[PDB]
Ligand binder design. Structure first.
Ligand SMILES: Nc1nc2c(ncn2[C@@H]2O[C@H](COP(=O)(O)O)[C@@H](O)[C@H]2O)c(=O)[nH]1
Ligand SMILES: [Mg+2]
Ligand SMILES: [Zn+2]
Length: 326
């Protein structure tokens, strides 16, 4: 099922060295990997090593894992390899800024989860899959694609010489797969609404306790949401360019629905682009802003993401007022 990287791909990755100038910039939240496509795999290797240590993973296995994961992301407009690395970098930044709050096991697992969270995405949402009795919606009744993404992750790990977690004790092994499982499922936005309200409630009543595994799971879940949506925390021009990619997939889905005799929601209707600005305002107010607000409360060092998100919210309002530019 899973595609496999060539020997030239993983072998070449092992010899990669991150340019000195980027070492500085990669630590910042607003960092945009966009202008460095050839370096994305190497950037991930770098983040893993800085966060988890150069010997955490056997280099050969890690490189095969990375290049195969890349080969298993499809050439879709948004849920692609570029997105995977973007999300992993946000997680890297969050972990670097809250290092000792998370275990070595969790950091390894979360960085890997972020790189694999949208594995083998076809370009169709859970709505489509369920509303069209796709085999996946039957196998996975809820969080359909997310369960599939996790399934894909384990399949890659099982490929020969690809299991980077085998050196963990039998106990930590199962523990890390559970961390990855929950983390990937948490990227199902449907689950975000409940998770955020819960955390907010926990935080304000003073109940939140990081030594409480159920609370840890929720915090990690919000972190995944935060990283998944981080394109809204970049400089405006970057945020805007990514938005076009997001909508390219939305509109493509809408077109397929029309062909199947079912009118799509406005957001997925390429004939209703005029409604995009207002729709983004809604998404920021109902999802992005609350997410980063709650995350900042729990992990103060992540405040730059909230500030950036608010700045972009202001940009969308500026568009609606007819003051946009370029
Ligand atoms: N309307 C809207 N949806 C977004 C935006 N950013 C992310 N999303 C949605 O949030 C989802 C997060 O889940 P994932 O990216 O892991 O599939 C994306 O797939 C996409 O459907 C945005 O700026 N606007
Ligand atoms: Mg996803
Ligand atoms: Zn994603």
């Amino acid at each position: 099922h899973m595609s496999i990287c060539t020997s030239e791909e993983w072998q070449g990755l092992m010899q990669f060295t991150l340019p000195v100038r980027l070492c500085k910039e990669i630590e910042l939240f607003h960092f945009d990997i966009g202008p460095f496509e050839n370096m994305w795999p190497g950037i991930f290797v770098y983040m893993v090593h800085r966060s988890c240590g150069t010997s955490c993973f056997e280099l050969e296995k890690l490189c095969r894992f990375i290049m195969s994961v890349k080969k298993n992301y499809r050439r879709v407009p948004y849920h692609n390899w570029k997105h995977a690395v973007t999300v992993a970098h946000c997680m890297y930044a969050i972990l670097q800024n809250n290092h000792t709050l998370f275990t070595d096991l969790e950091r390894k697992g979360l960085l890997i989860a972020c790189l694999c969270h949208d594995l083998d995405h076809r370009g169709f949402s859970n709505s489509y899959l369920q509303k069209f009795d796709h085999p996946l919606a039957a196998l996975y009744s809820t969080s359909t694609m997310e369960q599939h993404h996790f399934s894909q992750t384990v399949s890659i790990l099982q490929l020969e010489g690809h299991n980077i977690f085998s050196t963990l004790s039998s106990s930590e092994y199962e523990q890390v797969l559970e961390i990855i499982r929950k983390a990937i499922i948490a990227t199902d936005l449907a689950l975000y609404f409940g998770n955020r309200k819960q955390l907010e409630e926990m935080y304000q009543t003073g109940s939140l306790n990081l030594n409480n595994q159920s609370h840890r799971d929720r915090v990690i879940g919000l972190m995944m949401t935060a990283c998944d949506l981080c394109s809204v925390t970049k400089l405006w021009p970057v945020t805007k360019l990514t938005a076009n990619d997001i909508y390219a997939e939305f509109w493509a889905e809408g077109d397929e629905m029309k062909k199947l005799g079912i009118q799509p929601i406005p957001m997925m209707d390429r004939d209703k682009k005029d409604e995009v600005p207002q729709g983004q305002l809604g998404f920021y107010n109902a999802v992005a802003i609350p997410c980063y607000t709650t995350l900042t409360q729990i992990l103060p060092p992540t405040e730059p993401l909230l500030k950036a998100c608010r700045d972009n919210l202001s940009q969308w309002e500026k568009v609606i007022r007819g003051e946009e530019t370029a």
